[PDB]
Each structure stands twice: as structure tokens, then as C-alpha cells.
């Protein structure tokens, strides 16, 4: 008889498993698509990332997870609000919690590089990417405005 692999927790990352004879299928939620190896779901669309809500663009042409699993509050056009951190939506979009996103091809979790993807988080300063976060240093004479993310 068949193994019901859906009882395995590593099965169908960010997706809904449906057991079949042989292995199983992963049903991806709306806006998500199955990766090449069929072990999980990822949102592969591109869109702008916004700090407020759609305004205050901090990233251009980035994925929704890179935006929303970081400091973004809204993403894309038409504007989609990032899911709140305690919802099932956030669990699906950010399976590794804050600061990380699944590789669009291997679905392996990787650190989001905020300096490469969301430069607007440090307007006018020097950004250093870190594991799970990033650092922003404003040049001498300027200070980080926490609400706008602009050195001054």
C-alpha cells in the first residue's frame, strides 16, 4: 500500500498536499506556483515593495516574499497588503519567519539581502546585509529617520 506523504511535515512547502498512489501532489495557494522539483510553492511574480499604505517605494522588481518577509508593508501593482505576521498567510509566504525567503527554484530558505533588494530601507546611507536582517549607517551629519528610512 501507498505511503501518505502528507503526514510528513517537510512535504509541500507553502502548499497543500494531496496524497496519491506513488508519491503525492502539492496544491499551491493563489499567486503561488510549484517549483521545478515539485516539493513546494513560491510566488514568482515581480513587483514594487512599499513601506506605507501604496507609497514610499523601497524596492523595485522584487518578489512578494522578499518584500513582505522583510520590512515591506505592501507590494505590487495593484497594491497588495503584506500579510500580518501572525496569520496563516504569513506562514505560507514566510516559512522561515522574518528575514528569509525560499529560493524560487530549490525552495531552500535563504537570507533576504535587503541591501540588494530593498535599497530604499537605507536612503542615503550605507547598508550592510546580515543574517536575518541588515544594518544601515548614515553618513556624518545625517541620522536615520525611522518612519521614512531616509538618512534625514
Residues that bind Sm ion (CB under 5 A): 2, 19, 24, 111, 129, 134
Smallest distance from Sm ion to CB 147, Å: 21
Cell of 57: 517605494
Smallest distance from Sm ion to CB 114, Å: 5
- Closer to Sm ion at the Cβ: 46 or 116? 116
Smallest distance from Sm ion to CB 16, Å: 12
- Closer to Sm ion at the Cβ: 57 or 111? 111
Smallest distance from Sm ion to CB 51, Å: 17
Alpha helices in the chain (DSSP H): 64-68, 88-93, 114-117
CA distances from 115 to 43, 47, 67, 125, 150 (A): 21, 17, 12, 11, 14
Cell of 115: 541591501
- Closer to Sm ion at the Cβ: 60 or 152? 60
Q: List, in order, residues 6 or more apart from 98 with CB less than 8 Å away.
A: 69, 70, 85, 132
Cα–Cα–Cα angle for 63, 66, 67, rounded to 5 degrees? 90
Q: Which residues pair with 129 in a beta bridge?
A: 134
- Closer to Sm ion at the Cβ: 108 or 152? 108
Amino acid at each position: 500500500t501507498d505511503v501518505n506523504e502528507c503526514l510528513d511535515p517537510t512535504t509541500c512547502i507553502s502548499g497543500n498536499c494531496v496524497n496519491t498512489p506513488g508519491s503525492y501532489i502539492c496544491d499551491c495557494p493563489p499567486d503561488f506556483e510549484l517549483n521545478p522539483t515539485r516539493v513546494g510553492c513560491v510566488d514568482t511574480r515581480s513587483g514594487n515593495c512599499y513601506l506605507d499604505i501604496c507609497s514610499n517605494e523601497i524596492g523595485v522588481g522584487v518578489s512578494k516574499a522578499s518584500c513582505c518577509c522583510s520590512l515591506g508593508k505592501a507590494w505590487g501593482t495593484p497594491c497588495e497588503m503584506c500579510p500580518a505576521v501572525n496569520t496563516s498567510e504569513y506562514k505560507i509566504l514566510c516559512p522561515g519567519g522574518e528575514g528569509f525567503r525560499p529560493n524560487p527554484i530549490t525552495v531552500i530558505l535563504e537570507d533576504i539581502d535587503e541591501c540588494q533588494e530593498l535599497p530604499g530601507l537605507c536612503q542615503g546611507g550605507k547598508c550592510i546585509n546580515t543574517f536575518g536582517s541588515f544594518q544601515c549607517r548614515c553618513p556624518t551629519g545625517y541620522y536615520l529617520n525611522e518612519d521614512t528610512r531616509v538618512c534625514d
